[PDB]
Design a protein around this ligand. Structure first.
Ligand SMILES: C/C(=N\NC1=NCCN1)c1ccc(NC(=O)Nc2ccc(/C(C)=N/NC3=NCCN3)cc2)cc1
Ligand SMILES: C/C(=N\NC1=NCCN1)c1ccc(NC(=O)Nc2ccc(/C(C)=N/NC3=NCCN3)cc2)cc1
Lengths: 282, 282
């Protein structure tokens, strides 16, 4: 059964997806919520999500630590982005841009606040409505990590008389862990624009691993002919194998493909619609 | 002042070294102890040290979490190994071997139990008496780390469709973090045998960093002429720059230099002397 403290505040309803996500109604307000059930690092995910405040990142409404974990969240009526890209379905380039812009803003906000998501995937991008133009929110912070003062920094404060060479070599590449999120964004954007994954074991002899470490994405010219050169250019700068040369979220946001004032206006318009609100002075 | 709970059990006395280490007497037994004062990860060090049971690893007797941290430990009357190797003083090769054998046993025991020390240095090797033949104990677990289930293992359980190349590349070298302890042991052994450090900014133009990552130790043939070829051979196998080719503690313990039954008998003899005891059946 559901725990009593949850039943106290919420009436539970039908499954929305699957881990498992259920529809519920908050008794106090009679408004719909979603309740993620995680069968029994969740404490950390909760703590991370409670501190973050961004319109493209999902907010926690409540939490119950019972026989399983129950996380109450805002209901995202559009479901998962995954459902929009399966079956080689693909979005209009304009829609890809709106969604990707928001993903970039979200991930930029995470990285500024010392958080790496580490599991960015279409399944973890939720749409706020069934309309094609809508807000997206990033979810599922179960693999996420907090950037802080490292043991490396502490190690490098002394003289390395006794220090191993591999530690000194790792200084070259440290502090670029956040770049794994930009690679994922790149893969997501590729999928959204083309309707197929860049690295896959479908109709090829190269191993998935070897595809990825070489950076050799599967390019099918006629799927891409309809897509703009600027869109593909950005994809190329995100799917760079060297994490230090890979585009950051800031660099992606400055890319020509995202200098689209129509898209940006539509995003601001959707934000205003969402928000309610409170009177202001002057 | 000292905290009341400490004063309750112990009478405090003179400084033994410096962090700071004081002599004290346990009131109950009238026997000497050492009290490490760490001015305000210690919780973890305590938890690690409480679980470990080896004659060459220092034991915690008591702990007080007051305005500073106070860790009560067995008194090691010989002091630090550092004091035996400063001023280009060097130990008899036979004594180096006895001490190094014990360090190896200690570090082997740590690695079998999923602990890496990460700060092995002459300062953290304590001698049990002022006699040249004595027991040693490794101390100071403030930088130590617990090997466990990694985020890498979890990441590799799914299909890496969205996974970044650098993660896949790091699989090649993961799980060799323990090898930094073997490099330190190598540096320690070098110092003990020769009376000088292998990597240093003394009378050279090569940077310390460049000395270490190239593995080019400073070899002065006439300091070493008196040292056996087998001793130096082991040093060479520990100061290997590739962490995967570096000798492990097991490989070091199988090295010809440590197949010395006289040395091993002396170690067992010193162990028996230390222990007291309890009657046994049959
Ligand atoms: C509108 C909709 N579907 N529409 C359709 N379906 C049925 C009938 N109509 C919908 C379907 C699924 C979701 N899922 C969701 O929000 N999921 C979600 C999952 C996980 C998390 C979090 C924070 N997970 N964290 C966690 N996962 C593993 C370990 N950490 C947040 C939201 C939201 C909406
Ligand atoms: C016999 C002796 N000196 N003799 C001589 N001197 C004066 C008069 N005669 C002596 C001197 C110093 C020590 N130190 C010691 O045990 N130190 C010790 C230090 C730290 C720790 C630990 C567990 N530290 N952990 C901690 N350090 C930093 C963060 N974590 C344990 C033992 C022991 C014995």
């Amino acid at each position: 059964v559901y725990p009593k403290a949850l039943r106290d505040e919420y009436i539970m309803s039908k499954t929305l997806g699957s881990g498992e996500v259920k529809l519920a109604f908050e008794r106090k307000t009679c408004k719909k919520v979603a309740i993620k059930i995680i069968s029994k690092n969740v404490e950390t995910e909760i703590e991370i999500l409670k501190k973050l405040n961004h319109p493209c990142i999902i907010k926690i409404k409540n939490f119950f630590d019972a026989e399983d974990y129950y996380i109450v969240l805002e209901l995202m009526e559009g479901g998962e982005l995954f459902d929009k890209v399966v079956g080689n379905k693909r979005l209009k380039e304009a829609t890809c841009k709106l969604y990707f812009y928001q993903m970039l803003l979200a991930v930029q906000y995470l990285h500024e606040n010392g958080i790496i998501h580490r599991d960015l995937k279409p399944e973890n991008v939720l749409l706020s409505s069934q309309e094609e133009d809508c807000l997206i929110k990033i979810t599922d912070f179960g693999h996420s990590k907090i950037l802080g003062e490292t043991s490396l920094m502490r190690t490098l404060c002394g003289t390395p008389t006794y220090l191993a060479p591999e530690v000194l070599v790792s200084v070259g590449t440290a502090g670029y862990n956040r770049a794994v999120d930009c690679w994922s964004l790149g893969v997501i954007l590729f999928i959204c624009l083309s309707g197929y994954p860049p690295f896959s074991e479908h109709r090829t002899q190269v191993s998935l691993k070897d595809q990825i470490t070489s950076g050799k994405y599967n390019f099918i010219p006629e799927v891409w002919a309809e897509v703009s050169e600027k869109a593909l250019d950005l994809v190329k700068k995100l799917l760079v194998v060297d994490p230090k040369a890979r585009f950051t979220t800031e660099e992606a946001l400055r890319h020509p493909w995202l200098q689209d004032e129509d898209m940006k206006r539509k995003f601001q318009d959707l934000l205003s619609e969402e928000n309610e609100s409170t009177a202001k002075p002057q």
